[PDB]
Amino acid sequence: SYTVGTYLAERLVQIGLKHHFAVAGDYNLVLLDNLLLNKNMEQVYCCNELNCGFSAEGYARAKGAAAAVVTYSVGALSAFDAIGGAYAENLPVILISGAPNNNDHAAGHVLHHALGKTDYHYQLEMAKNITAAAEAIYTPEEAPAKIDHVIKTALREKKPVYLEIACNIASMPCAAPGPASALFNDEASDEASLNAAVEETLKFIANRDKVAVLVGSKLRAAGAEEAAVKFADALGGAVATMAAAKSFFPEENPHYIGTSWGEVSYPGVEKTMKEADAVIALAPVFNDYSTTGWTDIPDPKKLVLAEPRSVVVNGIRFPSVHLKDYLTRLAQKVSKKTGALDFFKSLNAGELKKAAPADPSAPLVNAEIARQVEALLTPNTTVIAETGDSWFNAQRMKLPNGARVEYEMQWGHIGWSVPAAFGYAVGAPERRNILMVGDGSFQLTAQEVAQMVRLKLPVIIFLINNYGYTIEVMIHDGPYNNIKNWDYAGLMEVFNGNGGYDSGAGKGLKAKTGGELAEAIKVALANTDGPTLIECFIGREDCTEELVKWGKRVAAANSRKPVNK
Amino acid sequence: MSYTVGTYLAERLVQIGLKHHFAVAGDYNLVLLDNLLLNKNMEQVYCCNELNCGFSAEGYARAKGAAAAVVTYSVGALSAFDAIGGAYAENLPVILISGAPNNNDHAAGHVLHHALGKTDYHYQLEMAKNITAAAEAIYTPEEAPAKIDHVIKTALREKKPVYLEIACNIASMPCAAPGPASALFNDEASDEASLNAAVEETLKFIANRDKVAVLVGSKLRAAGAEEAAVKFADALGGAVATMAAAKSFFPEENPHYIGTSWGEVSYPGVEKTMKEADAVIALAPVFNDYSTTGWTDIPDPKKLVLAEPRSVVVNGIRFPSVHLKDYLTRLAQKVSKKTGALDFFKSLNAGELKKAAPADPSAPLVNAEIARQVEALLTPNTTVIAETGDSWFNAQRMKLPNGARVEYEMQWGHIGWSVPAAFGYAVGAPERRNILMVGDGSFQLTAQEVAQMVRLKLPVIIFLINNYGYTIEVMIHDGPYNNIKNWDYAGLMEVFNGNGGYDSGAGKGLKAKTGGELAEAIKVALANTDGPTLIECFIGREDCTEELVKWGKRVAAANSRKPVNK
Amino acid sequence: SYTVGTYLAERLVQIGLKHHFAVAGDYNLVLLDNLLLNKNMEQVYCCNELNCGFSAEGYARAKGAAAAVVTYSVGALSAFDAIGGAYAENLPVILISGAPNNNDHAAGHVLHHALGKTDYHYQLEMAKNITAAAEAIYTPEEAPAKIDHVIKTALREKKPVYLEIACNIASMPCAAPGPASALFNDEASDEASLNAAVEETLKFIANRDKVAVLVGSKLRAAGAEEAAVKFADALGGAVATMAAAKSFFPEENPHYIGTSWGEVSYPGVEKTMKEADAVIALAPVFNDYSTTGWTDIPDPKKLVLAEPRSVVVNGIRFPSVHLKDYLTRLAQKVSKKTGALDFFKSLNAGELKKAAPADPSAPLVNAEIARQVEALLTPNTTVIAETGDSWFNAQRMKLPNGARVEYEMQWGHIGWSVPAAFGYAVGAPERRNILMVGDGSFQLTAQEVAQMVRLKLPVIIFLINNYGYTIEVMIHDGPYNNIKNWDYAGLMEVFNGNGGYDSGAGKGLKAKTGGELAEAIKVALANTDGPTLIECFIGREDCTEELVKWGKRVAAANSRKPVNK
Ligand SMILES: Cc1ncc(Cn2nnc(CCOP(=O)(O)OP(=O)(O)O)c2C)c(N)n1
Ligand SMILES: Cc1ncc(Cn2nnc(CCOP(=O)(O)OP(=O)(O)O)c2C)c(N)n1
Ligand SMILES: Cc1ncc(Cn2nnc(CCOP(=O)(O)OP(=O)(O)O)c2C)c(N)n1
Ligand SMILES: [Mg+2]
Numbered sequence A, C: 001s002y003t004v005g006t007y008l009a010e011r012l013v014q015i016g017l018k019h020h021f022a023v024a025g026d027y028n029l030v031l032l033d034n035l036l037l038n039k040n041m042e043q044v045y046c047c048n049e050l051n052c053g054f055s056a057e058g059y060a061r062a063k064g065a066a067a068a069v070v071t072y073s074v075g076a077l078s079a080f081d082a083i084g085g086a087y088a089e090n091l092p093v094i095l096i097s098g099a100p101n102n103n104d105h106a107a108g109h110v111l112h113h114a115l116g117k118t119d120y121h122y123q124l125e126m127a128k129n130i131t132a133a134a135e136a137i138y139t140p141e142e143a144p145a146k147i148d149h150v151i152k153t154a155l156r157e158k159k160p161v162y163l164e165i166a167c168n169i170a171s172m173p174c175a176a177p178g179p180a181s182a183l184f185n186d187e188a189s190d191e192a193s194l195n196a197a198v199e200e201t202l203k204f205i206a207n208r209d210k211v212a213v214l215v216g217s218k219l220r221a222a223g224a225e226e227a228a229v230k231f232a233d234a235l236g237g238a239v240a241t242m243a244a245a246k247s248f249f250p251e252e253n254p255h256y257i258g259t260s261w262g263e264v265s266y267p268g269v270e271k272t273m274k275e276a277d278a279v280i281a282l283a284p285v286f287n288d289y290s291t292t293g294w295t296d297i298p299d300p301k302k303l304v305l306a307e308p309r310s311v312v313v314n315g316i317r318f319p320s321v322h323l324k325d326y327l328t329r330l331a332q333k334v335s336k337k338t339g340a341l342d343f344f345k346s347l348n349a350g351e352l353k354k355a356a357p358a359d360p361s362a363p364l365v366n367a368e369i370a371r372q373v374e375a376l377l378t379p380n381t382t383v384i385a386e387t388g389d390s391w392f393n394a395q396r397m398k399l400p401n402g403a404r405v406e407y408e409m410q411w412g413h414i415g416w417s418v419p420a421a422f423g424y425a426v427g428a429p430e431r432r433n434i435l436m437v438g439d440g441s442f443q444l445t446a447q448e449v450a451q452m453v454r455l456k457l458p459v460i461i462f463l464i465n466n467y468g469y470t471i472e473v474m475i476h477d478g479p480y481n482n483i484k485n486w487d488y489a490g491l492m493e494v495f496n497g498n499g500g501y502d503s504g505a506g507k508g509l510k511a512k513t514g515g516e517l518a519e520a521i522k523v524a525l526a527n528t529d530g531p532t533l534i535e536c537f538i539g540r541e542d543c544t545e546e547l548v549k550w551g552k553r554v555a556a557a558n559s560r561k562p563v564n565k
Numbered sequence B: 001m002s003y004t005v006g007t008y009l010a011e012r013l014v015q016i017g018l019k020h021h022f023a024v025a026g027d028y029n030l031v032l033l034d035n036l037l038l039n040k041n042m043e044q045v046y047c048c049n050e051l052n053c054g055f056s057a058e059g060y061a062r063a064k065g066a067a068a069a070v071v072t073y074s075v076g077a078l079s080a081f082d083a084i085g086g087a088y089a090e091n092l093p094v095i096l097i098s099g100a101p102n103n104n105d106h107a108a109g110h111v112l113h114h115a116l117g118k119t120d121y122h123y124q125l126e127m128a129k130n131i132t133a134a135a136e137a138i139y140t141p142e143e144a145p146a147k148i149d150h151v152i153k154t155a156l157r158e159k160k161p162v163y164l165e166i167a168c169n170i171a172s173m174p175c176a177a178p179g180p181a182s183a184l185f186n187d188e189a190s191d192e193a194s195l196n197a198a199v200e201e202t203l204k205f206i207a208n209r210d211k212v213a214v215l216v217g218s219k220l221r222a223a224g225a226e227e228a229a230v231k232f233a234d235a236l237g238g239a240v241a242t243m244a245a246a247k248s249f250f251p252e253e254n255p256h257y258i259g260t261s262w263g264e265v266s267y268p269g270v271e272k273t274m275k276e277a278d279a280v281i282a283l284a285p286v287f288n289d290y291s292t293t294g295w296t297d298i299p300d301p302k303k304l305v306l307a308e309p310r311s312v313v314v315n316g317i318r319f320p321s322v323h324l325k326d327y328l329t330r331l332a333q334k335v336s337k338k339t340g341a342l343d344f345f346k347s348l349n350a351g352e353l354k355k356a357a358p359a360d361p362s363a364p365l366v367n368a369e370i371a372r373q374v375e376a377l378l379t380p381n382t383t384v385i386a387e388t389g390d391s392w393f394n395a396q397r398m399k400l401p402n403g404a405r406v407e408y409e410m411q412w413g414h415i416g417w418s419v420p421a422a423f424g425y426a427v428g429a430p431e432r433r434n435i436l437m438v439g440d441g442s443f444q445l446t447a448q449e450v451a452q453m454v455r456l457k458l459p460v461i462i463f464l465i466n467n468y469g470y471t472i473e474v475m476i477h478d479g480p481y482n483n484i485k486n487w488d489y490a491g492l493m494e495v496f497n498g499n500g501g502y503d504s505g506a507g508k509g510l511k512a513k514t515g516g517e518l519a520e521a522i523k524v525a526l527a528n529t530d531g532p533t534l535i536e537c538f539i540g541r542e543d544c545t546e547e548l549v550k551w552g553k554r555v556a557a558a559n560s561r562k563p564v565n566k
């Protein structure tokens, strides 16, 4: 039979979780005990609650969903930052918080970890701002319905949800869970709408021969990556990805022309998009970053807007049309529109100019790091790319089909990459997992590397030590862009703690030349027992051309005077 | 000199006594930070992450009375909210300022970086309202002066944190100039008739109750009533005990001080004395599940005089608008001697708190030996920051020379608070001997802020208690979740130093596995005036205070009590 | 082509609305103009915004959904009371509010109708507490998605939603609406769950022969009224309705045993429910009123809980199982369980004792009113029954199959009945519409009768004038239960205003004896041009036995001392 806690544990197992992440607190200890009863998933502990949230977020990138368990208030509030992030990045992360004994409500009790007033409804209220569903469970009888509701909602909407459970009901009996299939049950496309949206799209492109396809960062959330390839092959048009959609489309596909990112697009792409008679945008997010400071906004008159659950085409909005069904059906009826792809080729714009192997003993430069990392990419690889110049370095890399890039470009919380890489590596241990993180970002969440050591995960970490916040320097410079340098490589033996209570097998290495980097990378690949951090030394100014160009536009957008009135 | 939204804020902060403000840069606040840097009367101090930034400000407020933290929209503010809730719980006026979207982006259908991906940016304000005494968003320059003044006045009056957000494009725009600083501290005075009636009712109440005990609460400092409490205690000549979270809010060398009142983990004799008292005068107390030892130690309502910072309940009458400082002062002038409870305490011959004697220097280090050596470091110029964990209980057992301070975060109780709080405190009180007692588990949440101690060359002495896990949690309810990955904590110091890298540092990391190693480590720490010293102390998990074990069982029982029926 | 306003108007027409309700205000005047452009529905004006909301609420009871349009703040806030009520009663009412010019946001402007601060986000925030979805529209481009989202949500959840529209965008162009079918698109039951829920139900009742069916007040929201009859006929068990579900099951059906309402149940019903081995509850709401002050709570060990979208049976919870599918599938596989019905019959408990025709010239008594109203019931009739003794009078009435009763027993806002009867009558003009309202309730919303006169609706109103709040008196008595008496009958010629600017055809009559009532009823039926108010005079103490019994239990529940921490 089930308890509130084991009911939750089963539902989490049913949606495919093999792990959940946690930080203990007296308001959740019994809950954690009940979760441990289900042997079909492991309980993974984190350093702090912000990292715990981001670890779950990374896990969701690998496995589709995730769960984080924290304690009331002191745990939940910081975790909310990671949950907001999961919301921004369309990931079904389930945050569960311990909560006060249910006897303490409406009793005039001040409790530890709370604000010092006698009510405990505020945490729930805060959570409602950053989740698709949020439920508080005060009695065992209520648990099943509330658990099922937030989980179904998380899976359907691809957004995080919130649960809190009174600490004294976690072991109390409740109903048992029905079949897992109930949790994935979703509406199908409305047939009449699906067909009308496809027909209207055909009418729209009837006499527009240069059709371009723009791949957006919600393509995965729509589960429409495979259908986009089918559509692209049938169309035979030009396909470009928005920056945050890197790896959401096969880069070896003959129709792929590279990154569309305004004035920092791949060669030829910017012109091709400008020349296109029609742009079919697949689940895009157009924000101030992705439009390069509002300088690159798609022409409304040329745009077919295909969202995950609706299509706007030919001046008509079609709700209840799922992107996957739309792309698949379209691929069956659409005819060849090679116009934009032919135009692209006729530009002879060339490939992205990349640097050649540097002199091994020469001082390390940014391009040389990017080159060697790119040469590590296999169809089995995932690159977690942190906010900072790593965004742009990663964007310039050619991906073998199957290789993945993970970006957090909507939330853009520096430090995300470290615990996300941990969570991801736990969820996809079979992959070659690479983390590209700047020194500034690493300092926010560095400790979670110790958990990589703990669980013996072979994450390869490229710590770019350019002594400060370079992306920030390229937006607007000041003393606040300077940081205290660490001996990052030396941090590894600290987290190992060899000769202490336990042990570890992480490695820390320094790379000041191309040759040192190459040797470091060999050591990293041979290290199967723990993470390897490679501390790369480059100058602050030594960054991509793209960052500098993009940075100026971003700063301009941010600072534009107020308009009148 | 004319003002901008940014320099108006900077001046107000300087006017309330800030010599520093804490920040983490983000594109939504870069220009704001530039404007704050224009005022040379305070420094801009940078933090590793926003949670640490908030707790650094929180620690600074403990040293200087108020503080400010500046973060970026959404990704910065949300984690900082945890520290701001903490400031609320601990009654500290921390001002959180967040950068915000360009004011052209509102009601425009724009998706912005760092936000949820909808086109609305009101949610952060809404969340902030839950954990502050005031929260204001500034979208135009004209609105800035009123909203800045309002949240600052509120923070200072209520002794609670407040929230401001400023559109990133208005930080340099002109606005009115600030008037006199005195306007910011302007508060109502006690209502005279009420003040007198509360004092007279108190005298009537204790007329035929000779055993009067004074219970010092953790809001005594927030009420600014520490000094007046001593005056009242000396006039009364009764027994004075402090609640756990009030440690150091009353002079421990005062002849009336009988020690800690904390239920079954009170100092010897104190529990009985409080039970026997005919009247208990509670000065600004917080009675919660922790401070009542799992609801086992609750003051007798029929014996209680409840003197809160701004009201008094006495003799079955509530008197609002009576400030604790005035009440204590007015009372010290009229009250007569009530030595009953103090005489009773002495007659118990309950003795002093039994403390261990100097251990054999080469013998394996034990918890009591650490506590002994730390206690021997206490001077009238010392402050101990004591982390949630057994360090609560070790610190509680220490005798304080008059003037020595202990800082507790026992209401919020966010493990890891101690590290950035000690940083912020040390920035605000560099003249003091600053000691940090933090467990290994807590240290891992916020460890990086030690790098900022190294950066600003702050001589904080850190006792890292390495008992390999969450011992306080183990003593509440044990499971695999209480185990952590051990670090080489001492070695973390040379990492944050980064000597031979881009800059340098003068922190020191040392290990102590015996009393003798600890003693030598402490010498090195005191001689290190150029950076923090972390002393990694090795003890066993079960090697903790008796008090923690007793208190832990009661807490677990309270937490787990079955539901009652409608 | 469409504007923000005409897009909304079309969506409303697409979901079946033939009317929408409004109160003009400068923030919504242009919006109202755009709604008037769609000739497929009428714009109906109300006296005040509270009545406007309840009119829409009553319309939803007739047509399945409804819409109310009000002005910013001064209009919306009172209307929120009616929207909360629609939420409590599971009705898809769409509230649309005018809002400030979109130039006034983040501008430091104080605006008329607002709080006097410079921000206008508070109304939206308040609305979120009482709706299933709430969206503010500040630009035309955003309108289509936000409109579609709240309407789909209202229809799926059967809950009200909220929209606000900047006053200056109502005429601005936006995309056009796709097919209406997209708005009704909903997930189907999860097959595995549906089958498992049915099989578990069969196992549960395998060796429990006395099976009783308890019909709940969410049966209509689940669209499962018809399927419940099919299941009941197959089962051949005893069927009782909870008070608020009156008319949600055919009372001429051989299996119907009457009202189950604790100690105020129909004769024999209370015992039958106590004796049942299994109780199958179809979409019930168990609250402090419906359990008669927590005195009548179903035995958890006997209960099969069939909610609109889930089933809890045999200690297992099955989400994603729609009540309609569950009942239908169940009716195909279940075998005869006549146990509880046989037991009921064997009680020889008799019919509900009703009074016989009173002496026509004798002073009017409550029972005589109830008798004559009951005799007016036809398969084409709807009785709107107000909170008060009218609840209990209506509950005692035998319904010909097809006759409807409308209750607001969850919200229970006195005065709801008057504007609800207006809205209902507008939506179902073909029915004989009867309103049973007490004098105290009538005073809250009396003016909406003028709108019945205005639109020439033949609503028959029984105004029960017992000079005060009798239901309240029977709960707990005090001076606050006394009201100022009106000449209610005379109110009709006031609303007619004959000899003034316009005219009216309402009638007001008094009934102080059975004979006067009978004659009054004849005049009411012959009056096809306007409402007829029949003012019935009875004593304060002359109420149903049920109200007195139920009232005591309710008072006891309300006043029970606090249990200790
Ligand atoms: C939680 C949070 N706080 C601040 C920011 C603003 N921000 N964005 N990028 C940065 C600096 C980037 O630092 P690094 O990791 O060293 O990147 P690079 O120097 O460009 O290789 C900041 C401070 C942010 N995006 N998220
Ligand atoms: C942010 C936050 N997360 C979790 C908790 C719960 N908690 N309280 N105390 C602990 C364990 C602390 O262990 P240490 O710091 O090593 O101290 P010791 O008791 O001396 O072992 C936890 C995990 C908390 N109080 N705050
Ligand atoms: C808006 C609102 N305000 C107050 C109430 C409380 N209330 N509930 N029933 C009543 C009295 C009912 O008055 P009447 O219509 O005369 O009903 P009867 O006299 O029992 O036929 C009150 C005053 C309520 N249910 N709703
Ligand atoms: Mg850097």
Ligand SMILES: [Mg+2]
Residues within 6 Å of the ligand: B439, B440, B441, B465, B466, B467, B468, B469, B470, B471
């Ligand atoms: Mg420890």
Ligand SMILES: [Mg+2]
Residues within 6 Å of the ligand: C388, C437, C438, C439, C440, C464, C465, C466, C467, C468, C469, C470
């Ligand atoms: Mg009445």
